[PDB]
Write an enzyme that holds these catalytic residues in place. Structure first.
Site, short mmCIF file in Angstrom:
data_model
loop_
_atom_site.label_atom_id
_atom_site.label_comp_id
_atom_site.label_asym_id
_atom_site.label_seq_id
_atom_site.Cartn_x
_atom_site.Cartn_y
_atom_site.Cartn_z
CG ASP A 35 -1.80 1.19 1.33
OD1 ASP A 35 -1.90 1.91 0.31
OD2 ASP A 35 -2.44 1.37 2.39
CB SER A 199 -1.83 14.26 -13.51
OG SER A 199 -2.22 14.03 -14.84
#
Length: 330
Positions: A35, A199
């Site tokens: 994770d 992004s």
């Protein structure tokens, strides 16, 4: 040193991935959910409330000659999906794919929430976010990666998640045969403890690319791709009959649909998520309403590049003094 381990979807939807991890002496092998959105290595154990164990493999520290109680240490964590667990702490030897750390904090669950109990395939979590998020008190503990880092050939790990197929986590090296083209690296902020990056935009299907900054985290421990409501609306508007359902808890679409791809930007590079990756199947058994793999992050406080996004790429988690993230097509 290096390590390399295969990671395997837990079910036919790729809801999560499990990776075998050796704990203790002799080894006890547990299948952990790696994770990158948390920083605790915790396991179902001989200490876990019996009624909360249902099919998981447990760690029994009393059977490990290298286990030592970390006296006074406790831990307690809550995840973004509302699940949680807590307990006490041992140190022990932990190996992943041939890479061994001695003295790793292994957090033994005394309590786990129902979603953990109900998932027989996940024996615990192995956190790979920054150690500043580790919940052990009163002495915070380091992640497996942080403990291994100095011994690694290169201070990196990579995630290569499969679509409806196994993939690989590598530690200490970049497998140049595992991706196509080049790896594009992008800056990381560690201020919130996550692999947080920006992004450069998105496209829906064959549509034009929209240049826009989307701050989010690379989180192997989250199934879906959570993005701003504007972006998500633009995606689902291209699917006839798709709608946001408050009763179901997100966007659903007719199972008869063919989904468009979704592209996200990494610097000047582009990662394409095929439409099929965005199909999470019937909302309930036999339903013709299917659950979408791109959902709104509104109310989370941050965008999440979960498995849906990451499995479309070869992803480098560069833990050099200034961390960065790399993405390549594959």
């Amino acid at each position: 040193s290096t390590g390399s381990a295969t990671t395997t979807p837990i079910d036919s939807l790729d809801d999560a991935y499990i990776t075998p991890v050796q704990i203790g002496t002799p080894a006890q092998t547990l299948n952990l959910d790696f994770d990158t959105g948390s920083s605790d290595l915790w396991v179902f154990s001989s200490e876990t409330t019996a009624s909360e164990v249902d099919g998981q493999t447990i760690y029994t520290p009393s059977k490990s000659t290298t286990a030592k109680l970390l006296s006074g240490a406790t831990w307690s964590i809550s995840y973004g999906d509302g699940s949680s667990s807590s307990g006490d702490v041992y140190t022990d030897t932990v190996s992943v794919g041939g890479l061994t750390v001695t003295g790793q904090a292994v957090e033994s669950a005394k309590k786990v929430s129902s979603s953990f109990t109900e998932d027989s395939t996940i024996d615990g979590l192995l956190g790979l976010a920054f150690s500043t998020l580790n919940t052990v008190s009163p002495t915070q503990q380091k992640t497996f990666f942080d403990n291994a880092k100095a011994s690694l050939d290169s201070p990196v790990f990579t995630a290569d998640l499969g679509y409806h197929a196994p993939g690989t986590y590598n530690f200490g090296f970049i497998d140049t045969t595992a991706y196509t083209g080049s790896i594009t690296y992008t800056a990381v902020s560690t201020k919130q403890g996550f692999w947080e990056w920006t992004s450069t935009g998105y496209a829906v299907g064959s549509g034009t690319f929209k240049s826009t900054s989307i701050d989010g985290i690379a989180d192997t421990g989250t199934t879906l791709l959570y993005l701003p409501a504007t972006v998500v609306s633009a995606y689902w508007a291209q699917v006839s009959g798709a709608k946001s359902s408050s009763s179901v808890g997100g966007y659903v679409f007719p199972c008869s649909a063919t989904l468009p791809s979704f592209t996200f930007g990494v610097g000047s590079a582009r990662i394409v998520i095929p439409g099929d990756y965005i199909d999470f199947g019937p909302i309930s058994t036999g339903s013709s309403s299917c659950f979408g793999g791109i959902q709104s992050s509104a109310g989370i406080g941050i965008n999440i590049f979960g498995d849906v996004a990451l499995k479309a790429a070869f992803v480098v988690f560069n833990g050099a003094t200034t961390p960065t993230l790399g993405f390549a097509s594959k």
